[PDB]
Design a binder for this molecule. Structure first.
Ligand SMILES: O=C(Cc1ccccc1)Nc1nnc(CCSCCc2nnc(NC(=O)Cc3ccccc3)s2)s1
Lengths: 507, 484, 496, 505
């Protein structure tokens, strides 16, 4: 048992008792939401002990201790800002802005090759987020469910590997893409398809899940995994879009038969059944909120964010995520993996599975597709993102451009590096001063006491630093500070004639 | 940073540092003595080490004089704050990988010209540089070799860095072609597949400094190539150059083809740009300098052992992204799956390997792979992620049997904007609230300077702080509270 | 006059023994049971038992026996047929048929049981000329399934009824090339050509648009029975079931077009698939197919009957596509080395055509690499290596090759309006200008009928033409001079 | 007996006016300048000035002038020339050239200033026969750069020297396809066929192995002068260099072939390439080109000489490759619609062969979107839609086409009479095989008698009943005796034929 009283005094912030009207009010300001299966005991014991009082609103310290005990491991992270995204409210206030910009794209034709997908109205703006720590935010028509379509093909693969291993699985599918051209073909020279991300590959994958049973046992074996990955949230089914997909189930028929001749399915397997199973799976429906938990399930290395289960073997997660990078969202995949860099997979319903490994998993949804087969608002959001954030899979963490990295604090990181411009003026160090001037830094940013590099540099009595500040950087030679002591006034306050030799001439 | 601590960190209470130990312990961070950021600290040493009774010992105040020029780094280096703190046992692992990877004997040597047939099959260079500056090298590393195809990223990068992504990709493609469809040296809309293959490398070559001759451009190249390797070994092999031009018929055909398809800039020469391409593909480097370059990419343009913004992060981004998929020869498909690292193979036997924001490496085994990659080079590149979580799409947290060698500012900025919560967050570490800025003011003195009551309250209630001592402006807490 | 025929056969007697008419009738090729000789054969059986015993025949009954199908006997016995020398020609054909079995190697079509039951050592050759000249050797009459070999005929059939344009708005005509091959479609919509499975399937979707599968099958059996002379044109159900439950590829191929709308309006898939399977399993003998190949060589018109089966317009297209896209991926090298339009079926059969000459059929179940027959192609390539049949060989000059390809009307047509040059050109053939049609009229009768001075002036005194002899209407040369109204000819008065 | 020719021309008169002998020899199609008719001309001109006036000729001198060139003049005046009626056939060709000249469309090969000079309104046709029958109309005598049409010849030449087996170790014998078309090689690391630039470059490395690019040029001009009967075989250096500066692609093709073992042992690249340019920049005129094209139709033997120039096997192979791989990609639709071997050139000319018949040449600088000629192809397709020349056409029962292998007026009265001789012998199966082929049973002979008259005179009712009800033949009209079928059944005596003829009155 820790000193959970620390948390207490962290919230009480003065008076004796904690009004639970506030504990939760701040718990969600960290992003985390009440409905976390990890904060169940911290809410069940909360209700259970909060009705043993004159009025169920206040708290004694000992009763709070009675509440958390088992859910403190996480609350620690929540309020200590160990959450993989510390500042969440302003960051989500940015995500809402990008939702506003991307939603406005009045384009794209609705996937109307069957009625179910044509019913979805064009003006639907699903945006749901889930970080690998459980914190979540969402905006738009996120509560609306929709058939997943091709978006299910990644998970398929993963599941297979998670039970079968990479070796056995890739004995029937390829590991590489094919490109804009060589796109018509079903198979590769090795007489097997290119990757799980293409229809033929997805079919071959489906032929491996649970060998020796029927399409009702396999179906539940799948819905089990999807429920685990989504925090047991919405894992639904649409028989309507299933019959629509099987009646208009066009080429996939031919793909199935051709595969049937070339031993593209394991020994003793029927094509007609596996095909129908493929349709069933492609007809599964979820909402943005529920898919976000799955994207995050992959971002967290297989382990679910809002529960903590060994859902998928990290092996399968790695394979899946790489194949989503390269062979991801249709012929666009390439230009995506280059221009946006994130592993993803689009579905013809309008939703895009989007993973940012070890950060978050997301879900955007706009049925209006683009001539490429991908979403309109979806992609506009995808690249209106990395243009403002350093999430590009091969960007730089240390010296990114003018982007934003919310992995470090929001307010504190603005002083973690403005101080690092100034302490290169206390020992007489210009190496760091030229390393920070060559890093494109605004050389007049003040510190806590409102003193730029010239005030401290002139206070120490260092000539070279001022030689780098007043001439090489064009820093103000007539500045003030919080004590109202100009560079000459501090050169006089502490007794430096060699710096006063500089300050007298630059008037 | 009171450099004092650094002294006491090595001196261990005494006032006598035998620099025999200060250097021998600086090298414990992996970092080697010859860091151009450590010029003053290495000159001054000797320069002041000969102004003593005997040149070997050093006390505090005389020690300050040497490190007061490069303390910013030194502190971070000894505090184990560099991107790979534990570097010694990690290197002791690398050495084990090099020892196990030697045994891969087979593989035919690049014998299509005499120069590449010289190199003996029993050469196994491995070199490592960290994006902070931490360096290590093992094997036949300092033997120079013709660089070859490994040039294609860098040049590309340079071009982008000078002309931006847009311009460059009006002439080259961004995706690969696949196992087959590979012979077709050009794509639907004019341009070739990617800068990682001969065609693309030629198109790229045609962009570097448009408007001068085929020797001044070469200098604009060697400049950047020297910057990216920390001004270390940048070489040239005319012997391999004219041999490459005497048996490079295919590259002649490919190269010209685009002239008819108008896939070159306006007023561009054909065979001259081909000669430029050969010049670059003949350049000599050693495993060490190459590793320094790869690290120059890993750190986002900025070179580790210099402090130079070499390339804009845009170009490094495009470059790495393309190295992921189109880097190696055809195997790049399986490579980006089993290893997930951006790479680039050279026909000399060398592999350029990058780990973003971690390190840059370089291996070299002249014996080549049946597909065009290196033999032992690839066995090593695969035995890496067999013990490390560097695969780009691996997981930081839950890595199974792998290893992850990756593992006062907050005081007063909290008491400045009007929030005590951040001062309470220090309670998880049990921090004594006597931390100062250079004005010599603890957590209570800044509460007196700003004028926030809540800070004083919390710090003098559940914590306890001394309200008497002074600051550097000569105003105690009570004297500085009412002064404003 | 049949008198000429009779005295040409009897030669030196007045009664002909049956031991000579039959034994000599076949030397020029034709077979006794020719449907063009049905009246003559029935009438020659009829009188074989209207006598004490049948071993003799005088001109009395002969004249009535042969006059029912006489024109054919005329063209045939005189060796006017497109292949006159047939006995040494066949004694050579067999000489190559010996070299065709030589190569024993080859894997038998064992991807279904039925074709694996055809024993390995099965070899047969059948030949039928557009003139009915039929010769065969080996296990020729043994029926086998018309495998892929059926695909060309189908095409033609559709064309013959629907035309070239309409049909080829749904199928291609060029090959796929060496590679770009399995891609069973073309850049724009249609498949590649009828000689492949895709094109053949789209072809099957055109035969009788709006009926039943049996109702179509009987139409096809109609056309084929016409082409083959109502010989053994059969059907195999046993093999029909096999290649349907083992032709998964053809299922996929077929359905692929379903999505891409490459079929006519509302055509069902599985029905056309099953119909196609029925077609690809038809039992025929080598000879029965050779008659069809001859039907194509003759431009659609059947040889051993004389029926306008297929429009020549379709036969042209069919034969060209059989040249370029005929065989499997060997088709190119085939069109180069052998140059004939052909088509192979993995049953072991090769349909081989020599346009405007003859039609053949080879059969050797043992197949080879590309899917064609072993012995059959050794024969095919051994052919033009000995004869100038190659579609681009030269008739006049040909190294050492052996081409067996080698009139009273000419006075009457040259006596209507007056061109005497022909009458001179008849001096090289040694034609006595007393030539007569049945009306018993020399050149002078017509020359005097129409009226021309130079004709009489040149013929009477230089050729010794007679102004006397009679005709069937009893108007001698000088009679027609004035009976119609010509004064000048009335010359014939001075020639007495 | 040459004596016979004399009377064939003189028409039983005394002497022959050359005015008539030459004017009659030209209507044969043959023209004065046939090198096989040198002796028959030089002698004429020689003996025509051994007379009081040079015009007439007796039988003796005439005979003893033609006695050396008689084996040809025989088939010439016998009409044995494989195209007997040549004047009306050329009167058809002229109408075709007029029909195709209408096409004021296409674009001029303007990728150099040389081929941009040739005006768009230039259109020519030339025709030579395996027998020597020659006719030309249009801008036929104008020279133009040969261009791609050159490729077959070399192949033949190569095969003519060291055989086909050796040659096709280096090039392929099949086409490539619509796509897989820009590919410079085949799976066996060889080009697809000699009809494409790559294949022709591989060929050029075979001509005379062991000499220089000027002696090879000569060895070529030899064969080209032989095949054309020493007609115009020229050369344009300006177009050679011009197409070398702005051609360039064959540079890439060349070097790629250099790396992939695609040339014979010890071969130079740039030199052989320059040779390829030289060949492709040759000048010829429609007439010469026609002679050359016909040289292949005749199986190697030149039409206007009688010399075995090329080994026939090479002729055959070349012809097949011109069928399948001939004119650019159109090659397929051309081999299917038209069935004739050909080869297109970027100058506007098309080489055209009709095996064992003739060879021609049409020239239209205005080109097609496919790279073929505009009027050059319009004429070629207006042709087989009017002639049974399509390689896979029909000879016996072909539709409303023509066949100049037999005379025009002959085709009627040969089978117009052969319809009737069966109605005399009593056979109906011949009429069921002729009527089932749509042979007009109303066809009349010189005496104006249909089958109803022949059969009515003889009196075979299985014929007449088949002609009255099953054919609907007219029982009323006349003949040359004005004795209608009723009156012939009346004159020869059969009341049954009158019994059935009464039925149609
Ligand atoms: O190597 C083997 C056989 C082998 C041998 C051994 C083993 C296996 C297989 N065969 C070959 N190897 N290398 C070859 C040369 C490269 S192909 C020509 C280059 C291209 N030109 N345009 C291109 N694309 C366009 O899109 C053009 C375009 C532009 C504009 C508009 C439309 C289209 S690609 S061929």
């Amino acid at each position: 048992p820790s000193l959970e009283d620390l948390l207490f005094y962290t919230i009480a912030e003065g008076q004796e008792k904690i009004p639970v009207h506030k504990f939760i009010t701040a718990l969600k300001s960290t992003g985390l939401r009440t409905s976390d299966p990890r904060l169940k005991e911290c809410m069940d014991m909360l209700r259970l002990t909060l009705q043993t009082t004159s009025d169920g609103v206040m708290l004694d310290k000992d009763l709070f201790k009675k509440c958390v005990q088992s859910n403190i491991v996480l609350l620690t992270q929540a309020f200590r800002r160990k959450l993989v995204i510390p500042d969440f409210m302003s960051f989500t206030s940015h995500i809402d802005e990008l939702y506003e910009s991307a939603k406005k794209q009045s384009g794209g034709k609705v996937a109307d090759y069957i009625p179910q997908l044509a019913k979805f109205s064009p003006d639907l703006w699903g945006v749901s987020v889930c970080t690998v720590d459980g914190q979540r935010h969402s905006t738009g028509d996120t509560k609306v469910p929709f058939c997943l379509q091709s978006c299910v093909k990644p998970l398929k693969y993963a599941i297979a590997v998670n039970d079968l291993g990479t070796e056995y699985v890739h004995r029937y599918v390829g590991k590489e893409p094919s490109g804009l051209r060589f796109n018509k073909l079903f198979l590769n020279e090795d007489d097997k398809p290119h990757n799980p991300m293409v229809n033929a590959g997805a079919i071959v994958v489906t032929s491996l899940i649970k060998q020796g049973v029927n399409n009702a046992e396999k179906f539940d074996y799948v819905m089990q995994f999807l429920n685990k990955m989504a925090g047991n949230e919405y894992v639904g089914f649409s028989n309507a879009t299933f019959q629509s997909e099987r009646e208009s189930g066009d080429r996939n028929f031919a793909i199935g038969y051709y595969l049937k001749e070339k031993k593209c399915f394991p020994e003793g397997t029927d094509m007609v059944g596996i095909l129908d199973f493929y349709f069933q799976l492609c007809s599964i429906e979820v909402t943005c909120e529920s898919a976000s938990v799955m994207a995050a399930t992959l971002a967290n290395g297989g382990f679910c964010p809002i529960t903590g289960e060994r859902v998928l073997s990290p092996e399968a997660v790695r394979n899946t995520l790489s194949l989503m990078h390269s062979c991801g969202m249709y012929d666009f995949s390439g230009q995506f993996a280059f221009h946006v860099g994130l592993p993803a997979k689009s579905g013809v319903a309008g939703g895009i599975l989007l993973v940012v490994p070890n950060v978050m998993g997301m879900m955007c949804w706009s049925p209006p597709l683009d001539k490429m087969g991908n979403s309109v608002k979806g992609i506009h959001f995808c690249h209106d993102l990395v243009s403002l954030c350093n999430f590009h899979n091969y960007d730089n963490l240390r010296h990114f451009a003018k982007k934003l990295d919310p992995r470090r604090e929001g307010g504190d990181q603005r002083v973690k590096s403005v101080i690092n411009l100034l302490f290169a003026a206390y020992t007489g160090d210009v190496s760091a001063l030229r390393r920070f001037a060559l890093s494109a830094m605004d050389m007049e940013q003040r510190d806590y006491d409102s003193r730029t590099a010239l005030h401290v540099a002139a206070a120490e009595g260092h000539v070279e630093v001022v030689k780098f500040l007043l001439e090489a950087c064009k820093v103000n030679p007539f500045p003030k500070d919080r004590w109202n002591n100009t560079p000459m006034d501090e050169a006089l306050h502490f007794g430096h004639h060699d710096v006063f030799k500089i300050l007298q001439e630059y008037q």
